[PDB]
Copies of this chain bind each other. A is one copy, B any other.
Amino acid sequence: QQGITFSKNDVEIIARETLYRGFFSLDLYRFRHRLFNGGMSGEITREIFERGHAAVLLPFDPVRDEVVLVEQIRIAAYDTSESPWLLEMVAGMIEAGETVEDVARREALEEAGLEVGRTKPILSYLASPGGTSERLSILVGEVDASTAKGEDIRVHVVSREQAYQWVEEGKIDNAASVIALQWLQLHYHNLRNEWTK
C-alpha cells in the first residue's frame, strides 16, 4: 500500500505561542493543512507539551544474555500505577549540537556506571504525538552487566528473559523500556551473533 499521503509542505504553520514556560513548555500551534479530499482545512490551533527530545539506551550484555535496568521514582506514574518507582532504560535530553549516541553513552556512564562498547540503533519514536512533540531515539549498547554499579537511582541486572516477562506481566510498563525490550526479543539472536563474533 502507498503509505502516508501528505508531507510537511502540505501544512502551513501560521504561528506558535508559548502559553507556559517553566522547566518544560506548553505551546500553542496555529496551522492550516491539506485535507484528504483535496481541499484545505481552516485555521486550527492545538496545544503541544514541549520538553525537548531524548536519547535512550538499552544496556545489553550479549555474553550473559542480561540487561541493566535503572529504578527511580517517576511521580507522574503515581495516579495509575501500584508504585511510582519504575524500571527504565538509561535516558537523557539531547541538547543542541549533541548526537543521540553521545548522550546515550554519557547517560549509561553517569546513570548506571556503565562503559558501553558497540551501539546499534533500535527505533526512534514519538511518545504521544496527539499532545506532545517529544521524540525518543533508542540505541542498544553493548555492556558487561557484571560491572553494573551506578535523583536517587538503583541499578538492576536481570536476564533478558526475565525482563521481557516483566513486560508481559506489566511490571515494566513505560514506553521506552517496552519498545526496547520488545525489539530485543525480536532481535537478540542476531545481536548475540553479531556481538560475540
User: How many copies of this chain does one complex carry?
Assistant: 2
Contact of A26 among B24, B79, B123, B126 (CB under 8 A): B24
**Complex-state Cα separation, A176 to B154, whole angstroms:** 28
- Contacts A47-B24, A80-B133, A85-B4 hold; do A125 and B173 have CB atoms under 8 A apart? yes
A77: Cβ under 8 A from any B Cβ = yes
* Contact string against B for A residues 74-106, beta-carbon threshold 8 Å, 1 for contact and 0 otherwise: 111111111111110001000000000000000
Residues of B near A23 (CB, < 8 A) are: 47
Residues of B near A83 (CB, < 8 A) are: 4, 6-8, 10
Interface residues of A (CB under 8 A from B): 1, 3-8, 10-11, 13, 19-20, 22-24, 26, 29, 31, 33, 35-37, 41, 44, 46-49, 51, 53, 71, 73-87, 91, 123-136, 152-154, 156-158, 162, 166-168, 170-171, 173-176, 178-179, 182-183, 185-186
